Design a protein around this nucleic acid. Structure first.
Lengths: 150, 108, 393, 144
DNA sequence: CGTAGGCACGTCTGCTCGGCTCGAGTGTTCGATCGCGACTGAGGA
């Protein structure tokens, strides 16, 4: 997108607030961004690319929760995923956990989804190759436009 | 009756013209001076006050935006014919489980 | 070279830890106890693993790594302090990986763990089947990991399928328990109309689709085309797919592997494919030099079927002899450097022709002797010693 | 965990902006005592106190979306936050029509495409009143 | 008095059915040239 450098107004400063306090910078350079020329295609609603991105995003989140688990048989809880993705029906989450995990009801690891012993958890570069950040931006543009149209 | 170079060149020139108008307006440091039915919706509501009373409230909505969103739910709820249904499903599951236990008793 | 050496004896272990390699009859703790063939294969495997690191982390970041090492060394090289700073001129593995992680933000520790610390190459056996109903291509890739030189690959794997709609790349995840990989296939509407089939590069060509199957759109398959692993591939295509891959591919390693795989199919369509490769300038010359020997082997295998003259003789008289005299060779002008190499390699392959009696024919031996007699080199600006030496060969 | 930082723009009167700018570019902690910000529980009202002199403030919504972009080499820029609010110092009142840059003035009125068919919340309240009721009578009306 | 054998939820398992997307495959329409006969001015008998 074509950008155009303008000097800042003489009255405006930039306040960065966090939990601890306010911080102030001056700004001197501000660009105006023209009409964008899109290089990535935003998917449509209920598209095949849309549902593929939703499934791959849920799978990447599940793999990264398994990597974060400290238990020697890696184990996660279902309501962590239900807190992250609350619009998802639990059939889809159980579909993602069906391969790569199993539910232990009794004994040790009870009410946990332990990782299968034959399953090799993917490395960091494979998980990065699953979903790209630009696909997430295209999905966020689609669902925001879905809301505005709705 | 051109169907080829005319359309392509026309599109190209309109593209250069718009690109060049946008560049100029945006980079300008010039200061800019600060500058169907025609039908409303009316609703009558019947409620009971403390002790004993039956007051009725007639409320008129003149906002056509509020109208559209209001009516669309009724028309949907009119075609929509639930916590009660979930309770009914729970009762059904209890009955089915009792029947299964009776079947187990019959088998043993 | 390295897959032959590592399957022959054990494997080359870059970066051992101090024995770490006990499969081989010398100690790898010191350079002066290494076998010389091991030293040669060590340098060879080191530069191929560096090409793999360039494949994971792009070439400009790789040159930035090398420039950072050189710049640390040249700031170190001007100090006078006795090695307070002169040891920045010495590189290590941990320092090299740390500089890579500094310039790129990715670390290569799985790739380092697989191809450096582990000492093995991988073997791929592939076979496909086209499902016409669901329009999919079911690949079947199995590894031989129980041979003495081999190891098991669990990473991703690129495969390139040339169908009628073009060339498509697919990434396959080859875990330990994996065997069947279903990839999707495109249309076959470039057989409905005669349109040109688009290639791996941007161009497109006219293909003779009479040899292709009617139900499958796919023309050829290549497992790991970019040589992104240290591998030996054994793919089972059909012979027309090998001939299409020899003719219309825009990759020299795929043309070479199709030449290497056409020796098992001595059909006359393969003879036509190799002869069309031999006649074709704008093919890479080392592919035509291989097609000479492949054509000689195929010609030896289809005796009592061969129709006309011996192989490559009419082609030699068409390319390198006079128009008015077929058995007199043209006077030597070696200024093209690709028909020079092809001219000096074609009788060497032509002499491997054999008759039904297992004796070289007296039509090819007489042709080679007439190539020797009528040799005139008083007119080119180049010497004749290699061409005459190849005539003796 | 990590919480995304919340950056906004502070607009001051021009003499007070010059004193605050001089104190910022000086860099001492003397500025910390001089400049304070008190945000009222309205959420859209405040005091900015420059040199202990109170100024009345309003937190307004900006028509465009700005993004802070940091850099280390001035060739690649990383987005750090989204700015949409400004605490100008001196509902419909809390919406700013103009943009910060000079070319963007009256952007909301002129350079913004408007598509139309609070209101949703009012409809939800009406539905709740209908539920708490017993009998509901409705008619699309005419002039009356 | 204690003490082991039957009733509610929660979450997962598995199969069935209906709906939606999406691309391959096939038939249909319409401008874009190709060729034929003809129109119509034109320099030599």
């Amino acid at each position: 997108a074509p950008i155009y450098l303008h000097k800042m107004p003489e009255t405006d400063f930039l306040i960065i607030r966090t939990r601890q306090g306010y911080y102030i910078r001056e700004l001197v350079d501000i660009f105006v961004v023209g009409q964008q020329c899109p290089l990535f295609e935003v998917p449509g609603p209920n598209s095949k690319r849309a549902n593929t991105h939703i499934r791959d995003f849920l799978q990447v989140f599940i793999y990264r929760l398994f990597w974060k688990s400290k238990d020697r048989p890696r184990r996660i809880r279902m309501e962590d995923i239900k807190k992250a993705f609350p619009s998802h029906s639990e059939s889809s989450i159980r579909k993602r956990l069906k391969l790569c995990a199993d539910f232990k009801r009794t004994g040790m690891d009870s009410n946990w989804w332990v990782l299968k012993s034959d399953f090799r958890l993917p490395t960091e570069e494979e998980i990065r190759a699953m979903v790209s950040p630009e696909q997430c931006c295209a999905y966020y543009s689609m669902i925001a436009a879905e809301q505005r149209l709705k | 009756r051109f169907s080829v170079a005319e359309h392509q060149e026309r599109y190209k020139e309109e593209c250069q013209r718009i690109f060049d108008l946008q560049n100029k307006v945006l980079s300008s440091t010039e200061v800019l001076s600060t500058d169907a039915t025609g039908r409303c919706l009316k609703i009558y509501r019947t409620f009971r006050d403390e002790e004993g009373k039956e007051y009725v409230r007639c409320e008129t909505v003149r906002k056509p935006a509020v109208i559209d969103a209001y009516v669309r739910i009724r028309t949907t709820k009119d075609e929509e014919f639930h916590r009660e249904e979930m309770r009914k499903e729970r009762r059904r599951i209890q009955e089915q489980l009792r029947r299964l236990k009776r079947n187990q008793e019959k088998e043993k | 070279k390295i897959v032959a050496y590592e399957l022959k004896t054990g494997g080359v272990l870059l970066h051992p830890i101090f024995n770490p390699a006990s499969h081989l009859h010398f100690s790898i703790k010191h350079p002066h106890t290494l076998s010389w063939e091991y030293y040669s294969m060590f340098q060879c495997k080191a530069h191929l693993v560096m090409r793999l690191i360039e494949n994971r982390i792009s070439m400009e970041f790789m040159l930035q790594v090398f420039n950072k090492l050189l710049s640390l060394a040249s700031t170190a090289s001007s100090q006078k302090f006795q090695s307070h700073m002169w040891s920045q001129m010495l590189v290590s593995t941990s320092g090299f990986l740390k500089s890579i992680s500094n310039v790129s933000g990715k670390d290569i520790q799985p790739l380092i763990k697989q191809w450096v610390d582990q000492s093995g190459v991988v073997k791929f056996y592939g076979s496909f089947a086209f499902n016409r109903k669901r329009n999919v291509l079911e690949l079947e890739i199995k590894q031989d990991y129980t041979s003495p030189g081999t190891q098991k690959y669990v990473g991703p794997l690129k495969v390139t399928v040339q169908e009628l709609d073009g060339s498509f790349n697919h990434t396959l995840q080859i875990e330990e328990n994996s065997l069947k990989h279903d990839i999707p296939c495109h249309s076959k509407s470039r057989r409905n109309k005669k349109k040109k089939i688009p290639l791996m590069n941007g161009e497109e060509v006219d293909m003779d689709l009479s040899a292709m199957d009617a139900d499958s759109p796919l023309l050829w398959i290549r497992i790991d085309p970019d040589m992104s692993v240290l591998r030996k591939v054994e793919f089972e295509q059909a012979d027309f797919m090998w001939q299409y891959q020899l003719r219309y591919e825009r990759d020299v390693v795929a043309q070479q592997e199709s030449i290497l795989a056409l020796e098992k199919f001595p059909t006359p369509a393969s003879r036509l494919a190799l002869t069309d490769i031999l006649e074709q300038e704008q093919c890479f010359y080392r592919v035509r030099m291989s097609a000479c020997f492949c054509l000689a082997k195929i010609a030896n295998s289809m005796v009592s079927t061969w129709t006309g003259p011996p192989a490559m003789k009419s082609l030699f008289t068409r390319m390198f002899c006079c128009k008015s005299c077929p058995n007199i060779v043209k006077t030597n002008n070696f200024m093209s450097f690709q028909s020079y190499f092809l001219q000096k390699t074609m009788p060497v392959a032509m002499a491997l022709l054999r008759d039904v009696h297992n004796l070289c024919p007296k039509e090819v031996l007489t042709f080679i002797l007439d190539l020797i007699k009528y040799n005139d080199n008083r007119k080119n600006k180049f010497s004749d010693n290699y061409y005459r030496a190849e005539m003796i060969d | 965990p990590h919480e995304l930082e919340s950056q906004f723009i502070l607009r001051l009167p021009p003499e007070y902006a010059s004193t605050v700018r001089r104190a910022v570019q000086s860099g001492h902690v003397n500025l910390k005592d001089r400049l304070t910000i008190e945000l009222h529980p309205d959420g859209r009202h405040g005091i900015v106190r420059v040199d202990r002199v109170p100024l009345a403030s309003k937190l307004v919504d900006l028509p465009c979306v700005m993004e802070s972009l940091k850099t280390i080499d001035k060739k690649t820029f990383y987005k750090t936050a989204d700015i949409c609010q400004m605490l100008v110092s001196t509902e419909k009142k809390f919406i700013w029509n103009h943009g910060i840059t000079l070319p963007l003035k009256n952007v909301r009125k002129r350079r913004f495409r408007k598509t139309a068919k609070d209101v949703e919340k009012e409809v939800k309240r009406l539905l709740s009143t209908d539920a708490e009721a017993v009998s509901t009578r409705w008619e699309i009306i005419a002039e009356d």
